[PDB]
Amino acid sequence: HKVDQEFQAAVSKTSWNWLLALFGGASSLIVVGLIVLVCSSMLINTRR
Amino acid sequence: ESDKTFPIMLNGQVNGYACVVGGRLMKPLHVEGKIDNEQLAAVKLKKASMYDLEYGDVPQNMKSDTLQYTSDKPPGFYNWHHGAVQYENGRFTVPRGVGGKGDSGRPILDNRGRVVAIVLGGANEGTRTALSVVTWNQKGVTIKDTPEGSEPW
Amino acid sequence: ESDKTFPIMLNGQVNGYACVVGGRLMKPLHVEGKIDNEQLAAVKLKKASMYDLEYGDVPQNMKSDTLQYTSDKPPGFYNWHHGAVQYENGRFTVPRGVGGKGDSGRPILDNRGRVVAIVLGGANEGTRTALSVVTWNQKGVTIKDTPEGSEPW
C-alpha cells in the first residue's frame, strides 16, 4: 500500500453526513433547551 | 380563618400554617412539618422552589368552602389574625414587635372575607416591620415581594 | 317554569325535563323517554351528541310563548324550582341534599324570569353540590361548565 490510511480522510461523506446529523441533533437540542430556559427566565423577570 | 387554616406540627410544635384558596392548598416550603389534617397528609404537593412554596390539589369535600380569592388591592388597612396590616406604597407592613417565627403561611384576609396575600417572612426597620409576602397582580401574576433584609419566618 | 317545562316519561316514571327557549325546544341526550306533549312529538330532534343534547324547531302557534335566554350573568343567587342556586367564579352550586336524578333539563331562572342555564347533572361535595350545566356567553356562545366528578342526572 503506497499511501497510509488516516482517520480524517478515511470515512465516506455519507457516513460523515449521517454521523454529523446525529450528533448535531443532540447539540441543537441542548442549545434550544438552554435558550428556552433563558427566555423563560427573562419572561418571568420582565412580567414579574 | 380559624376554621379553614390548619396548624403544622414540627416535633409537636406549631411552626406555620397551610392555606386553601380556590380549591388548591398552599404551604411555604421553608417551613418543615406535618399537616395536622389526616386527609391533607395524603395530598400530593408539587413545589415552586423559587417562590418558596408547594401547592397541591385538594379533595372534593372541602374545595368549595375555601377562602375566596381577589386581586384588587387599594392601599389601606387589611384584616389579619394578629390585627390589621397596612398596605402602602405597594408594601405590606405591620407594627414592629408583632409577628415572628411560626407565622409563615398566615393568610391576610379582606373585609369581605377574601385573601389578598400570604405571609412568608418579615424584616424589622425599627419603626415598622415590612412583611416579605406573595402579592398578586391584575394580569394574574404572583410576585413574591421581599423587602431588603427579609428573613423567612 | 311550571307552564312551559314539560316532563319526559319512561314506563310511567319521570326521568327528565325538556325546555322551550328562544322559540326552539331542547331535550338532553343522557335521559331516554317520551315527551309528554303530543304536538312537540312530531318535531325531528337534531342531535348535538358532544353537547349531550337535542334541539328542534317548534311549530308556529306556541313559538310566541316561550322562555327567554340571557347572556348577562351577575354573580350571586338565581331562581330554581328547588330554591336559590349560587353562582360565583364561573361556577354554579346548590346547597347539598337539593336536587337529584330526573332533574336534568330544568332551567335556571333569574329575577326577570329569563333562563340563565340548563341543569344537566350535579356532583355532591359535602358542603354543597356543584352543578354541571350549560351556559351562554357574551359573544353568542354556548359553553359547558362540568366540574370534576360530575355525574349526569
Read off the C-alpha cell for C16.
327528565
Burial C23-43, CB ≥16 within 10 A → b, else e? eebbbbbebebebeeeebeeb
In chain C, domain spans = 4-67, 68-153
**What is d(CA B96, CA C135) in angstroms, rounded to the nearest whole number?**
50
From first CA to last CA, the distance across chain A in angstroms is 69
**What is d(CA C130, CA C145) in angstroms, rounded to the nearest whole number?**
10
The answer to whether the beta carbons of residues C109 and C1 sit under 8 Å apart is yes
> In C90-150, where do the E strands start and end?
91-95, 107-109, 115-124, 128-135, 143-145
Closest CA of chain B from C29, distance in Å: 27
Strands B107-109 and B91-95: unpaired
Surface of B (93-132) touching C: CB under 8 A: none
Dihedrals phi, psi of A33, to nearest 5 degrees:
-60, -45
What are the beta bridge partners of residue C34? C9
The answer to whether the beta carbons of residues C85 and C131 sit under 8 Å apart is yes
Residues of A in contact with B141 (CB under 8 A): 47-48
Cell 407592613 identifies what position?
B93
Read off the C-alpha cell for B90.
405597594
Of B16, B130, B6, which is closest to residue B58 (Cα–Cα)? B6
What are the beta bridge partners of residue C95? C128
Burial C87-116, CB ≥16 within 10 A → b, else e? beeebbbbeeebbeebbbbbbbbbeeebbb
From first CA to last CA, the distance across chain B in angstroms is 19
Listed resolution, Å:
4.7
Neighbours of B134 (CB within 10 A): 18
Query: Residues B42-45: contacts with CB within 8 Å, 24+ apart?
Result: none
Cell 356562545 identifies what position?
C141
**What is d(CA C116, CA B75) in angstroms, rounded to the nearest whole number?**
36
Nearest chain A alpha carbon to B142: A48
Touching pair B, C by Cβ (3+ pairs < 8 Å): yes
Touching pair C, A by Cβ (3+ pairs < 8 Å): no
Q: Does B63 touch chain C (CB under 8 A)?
A: yes
Q: What is the DSSP string of A1-48?
A: --S---SGGGS-HHHHHHHHHHHHHHHHHHHHHHHHHHHHHHHHHHH-
Say how far residue B145 (Cα) sits from the centre of its chain: 12
Secondary structure of residue B77 in the 3-state scheme: strand
Closest CA of chain C from B150, distance in Å: 34
**What is d(CA B127, CA B124) in angstroms, rounded to the nearest whole number?**
8
Do B64 and C93 count as a contact with CB atoms less than 8 A apart?
yes
Q: What is the DSSP string of C40-72?
A: GGGS--EEETTTTEEEEE--TGGGGS-B---S-
Of B134, B143, B136, B69, which is closest to residue B104 (Cα–Cα)? B134
